[PDB]
Design a protein around this ligand. Structure first.
Ligand SMILES: [Cu+2]
Ligand SMILES: [Cu+2]
Ligand SMILES: [Cu+2]
Lengths: 348, 333
């Protein structure tokens, strides 16, 4: 069958999204959340809802998607794996100058089909080691159905800008002139400028943009590249973009107060957690329903490394993500004072 | 004048210790602590007390000590600035300063003079010891072999190239047999201390597998944060950072207590025999492969003050025992 994202029932789907929760504790003897629970979204369900599965189960959209690639590949099935922190079974040291971008491009040459999985797990994925990695952080996933020509145009962009660190690839007999093949070879090309944006569509016709920075980029990825590219403002007002010092409590002791929380309780996932326990590599705009899922988090301080984000319009998913904000002030402070503390992390 | 630590009143002193507080917010208008306030200790005062100074003022033991070395050095005065950054292919700083004509020296842990890194966030310890030139040389020989620090802005002061202090300014190529080393020294005032070092081969627990056994006393680690506590449930599914372990100076006249995660935590004490340790290595289980070490000395007064800085605050609905179990869970690999 044609390479495709698989949904929660192991059926082909054009696009899916997941938001995985972090590991969340009651005490030393039990957890509220293991860190493998998640909410799931695609356009056939049409709503963001808590999944009955855990991401490390041998079921659910993540497992079914990757098992349909790694499980029993045909002779023309192949994949490009990349991560700035390679998994142990690559048995290679990391090149810190390469892109800080993570994902899987899988393809089948005979059927001219492909898929792209974006994730933010270090040391993932492996084509032969089972399971999933660290459960400690909130994380987002996006999985897109592509044709082979689109996968190749994406691979051509990555060779120049994102510059992913590729490991354990399978070529599936690719012709060596393929841009997908070139992504398995050393990346040396010089890039024009410090950023690049390209328009693509899924096989099902869903438009998306891949907005990429290269190692020469030094400005604000979100406000100076993504916003301008989308012709919209990023909704950054309540972003944690730096460290907040401890604050005084009424007992005379200073404590960590998170202030900004991410809250999935309206979506059926009965948890809320500090934004500092979240990879926070997603963002939305204030208008036009853009949802961005990618490699780059919200911190002002960034390494000069390649990477990017995927942007697409989706009113349902936009509204669900918009309403996950939760602001809790430190003791004695107002909502207004709490929001000012968050904004203070946006300055140098 | 011979090289010597200087106390809060710019008098020569054999040894002094300081604990600087992190920057701590009161509200949008003011900080409870700027991050330069500190408590100070030496054996002349005989108690750990809040200083009236800010550490970055041109007053107080740290400034007076540094100014006595770098402000107007004599022709045979020299120094080695070092840190534990990895060699060439956010780090612990120190200074060894010396004067050949007077055969005098001092060792300052966790600070450099301002000009070596010009312009508060975290709690930090400081220690300064009076040494003779021979002892400073034996310390430098150990560092060339084991800790292998990176060296910055040295001044040789005419040292002979055969001196181990001079050797510390030259490329460090040694590769010792064994993974660690310990040496005994004394200050000019006669206070014994040990320097306990690991080199880059060391892969075990620095504190429990090297320092403790070397001292023949267990490190007091039971309430150490040695890793990350996940967010903990408050109510209705909202999980928050509960620090659980705090460092509390309020019994010492310094009105601040803060999370141990806002502290460099490059110090420890033993459960018996009053050992105080200040060094390069923090309390985290996860450690990079690199040389480094700690000073250890006995001090009943300083030990008790540091012991009593423990503050445990359980998350809501939890007992003290449950809180301590959550702290101990961070000790797992
Ligand atoms: Cu990196
Ligand atoms: Cu070729
Ligand atoms: Cu000679």
């Amino acid at each position: 069958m044609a390479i495709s994202p698989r949904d929660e029932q192991n059926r082909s789907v054009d696009l899916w999204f997941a938001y995985k929760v972090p590991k969340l504790t009651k005490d030393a003897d039990s957890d509220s959340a293991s860190g493998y629970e998640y909410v799931y979204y695609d356009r056939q369900v049409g709503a963001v809802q808590k999944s009955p599965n855990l991401m490390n189960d041998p079921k659910g959209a993540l497992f079914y998607t990757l098992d349909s690639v790694f499980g029993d590949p045909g002779d023309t099935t192949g994949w490009i794996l990349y991560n700035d922190e390679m998994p142990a079974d690559a048995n290679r040291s990391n090149n810190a100058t390469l892109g800080h971008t993570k994902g899987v491009i899988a393809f089948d040459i005979a059927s001219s089909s492909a898929l792209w999985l974006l994730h933010s797990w270090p040391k993932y994925a492996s084509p032969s080691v089972p399971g999933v990695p660290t459960p400690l952080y909130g994380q987002t996933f996006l999985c897109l159905s592509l044709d082979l020509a689109t996968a190749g145009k994406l691979a051509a962009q990555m060779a120049l800008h994102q510059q992913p660190q590729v490991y354990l690839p399978r070529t599936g007999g690719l012709d060596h002139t393929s841009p997908l093949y070139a992504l398995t070879q050393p990346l040396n090309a010089s890039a024009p400028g410090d950023s690049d944006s390209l328009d693509f569509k899924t096989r099902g016709g869903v438009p998306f943009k891949v907005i990429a920075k290269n190692r020469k980029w030094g400005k604000d990825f979100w406000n100076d590249l993504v916003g301008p590219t989308l012709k919209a403002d990023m909704y950054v007002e309540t972003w944690i973009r730096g460290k907040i010092p401890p604050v005084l409590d009424s007992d005379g002791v200073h404590k960590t107060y998170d202030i900004k929380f991410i809250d999935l309780r309206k979506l059926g996932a009965p948890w809320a957690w500090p934004e500092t326990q979240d990879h926070a590599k997603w963002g939305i705009t204030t208008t036009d329903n853009w949802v961005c899922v990618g490699d780059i988090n919200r911190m002002v301080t960034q390494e000069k490394r390649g990477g990017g984000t995927i942007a697409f319009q989706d009113p349902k998913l936009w509204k669900a993500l918009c309403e996950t904000d939760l602001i809790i002030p430190p003791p004695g402070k107002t909502d207004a004072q709490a929001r000012a503390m968050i904004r203070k992390t946006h300055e140098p």
